Amino acid sequence: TADDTVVLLNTVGHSALDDANFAAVLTALKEANAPHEEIAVESVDWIDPDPNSRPLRALHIEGEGSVDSGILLAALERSFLQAGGRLHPVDATEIRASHGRVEGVVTDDGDFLPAGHVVVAAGARSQR
Amino acid sequence: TADDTVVLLNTVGHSALDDANFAAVLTALKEANAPHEEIAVESVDWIDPDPNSRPLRALHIEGEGSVDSGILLAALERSFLQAGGRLHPVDATEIRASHGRVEGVVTDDGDFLPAGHVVVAAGARSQR
Numbered sequence: 001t002a003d004d005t006v007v008l009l010n011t012v013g014h015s016a017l018d019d020a021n022f023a024a025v026l027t028a029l030k031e032a033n034a035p036h037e038e039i040a041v042e043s044v045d046w047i048d049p050d051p052n053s054r055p056l057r058a059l060h061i062e063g064e065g066s067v068d069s070g071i072l073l074a075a076l077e078r079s080f081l082q083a084g085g086r087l088h089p090v091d092a093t094e095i096r097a098s099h100g101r102v103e104g105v106v107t108d109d110g111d112f113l114p115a116g117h118v119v120v121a122a123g124a125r126s127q128r
Numbered sequence: 129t130a131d132d133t134v135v136l137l138n139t140v141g142h143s144a145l146d147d148a149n150f151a152a153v154l155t156a157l158k159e160a161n162a163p164h165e166e167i168a169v170e171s172v173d174w175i176d177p178d179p180n181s182r183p184l185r186a187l188h189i190e191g192e193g194s195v196d197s198g199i200l201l202a203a204l205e206r207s208f209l210q211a212g213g214r215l216h217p218v219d220a221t222e223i224r225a226s227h228g229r230v231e232g233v234v235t236d237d238g239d240f241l242p243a244g245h246v247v248v249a250a251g252a253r254s255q256r
Binding site: 015057 | 137139141142144147181182184185
């Protein structure tokens with residue numbers, strides 16, 4: 001959805017975070033030889049801030065962009081099926097292991113799925 | 129009382145004045161080849177602003193300073209007497225002129241002072 005990012009510095013925050021972090025971003029960009037420049041705030045397109053909340057410094061970072069997370073998920077699902085992956089729309093309840101090896105996964109419908117590899121990427125539920 | 133001036137840009141004002149005027153100061157300094165530099169706000173000595181009112185840009189102007197107006201007035205009075213001036217601590221009430229020439233000044237004590245030269249520097253009362 002975008003190729004580039006503009007980092008804005010305004011005074012609606014702590015100097016001890018926002019001033020220090022703006023300097024650290026500028027430094028980290030220089031260290032990594034990343035393409036960027038400090039630009040005039042008047043050259044940032046579209047923004048129409050409250051003058052009392054407006055930025056006084058702006059940082060254009062080239063090749064630091066954004067994705068539509070919904071279109072990304074759809075494209076990952078599509079790409080998974082295309083490569084022969086199978087989607088089973090149930091939740092794991094329990095990982096089964098014995099003698100220090102994975103056997104598979106009990107699902108919340110009562111079934112058991114056997115496997116020699118289990119990758120846990122269950123977000124905030126992963127450790128539990 | 130000082131040799132140098134720091135111009136501060138904060139967001140406690142209109143962008144249409146403060147942003148335009150900061151740019152105009154920077155421009156006028158560059159045009160005149162006047163000694164100055166845009167400095168980090170963290171390098172401005174003494175200031176301890178409210179973070180929500182703090183400056184995000186600062187401009188050091190070299191050889192643009194200040195005087196104590198009270199010591200200046202005392203020094204001007206002293207220097208006037210030294211050069212043969214006489215201080216008469218009354219106010220002019222009326223300038224007298226005839227045949228398109230100054231005759232002198234009626235003072236608020238009722239007296240009349242004759243002169244061939246009258247210089248009006250009575251601040252806001254000068255035109256009246």
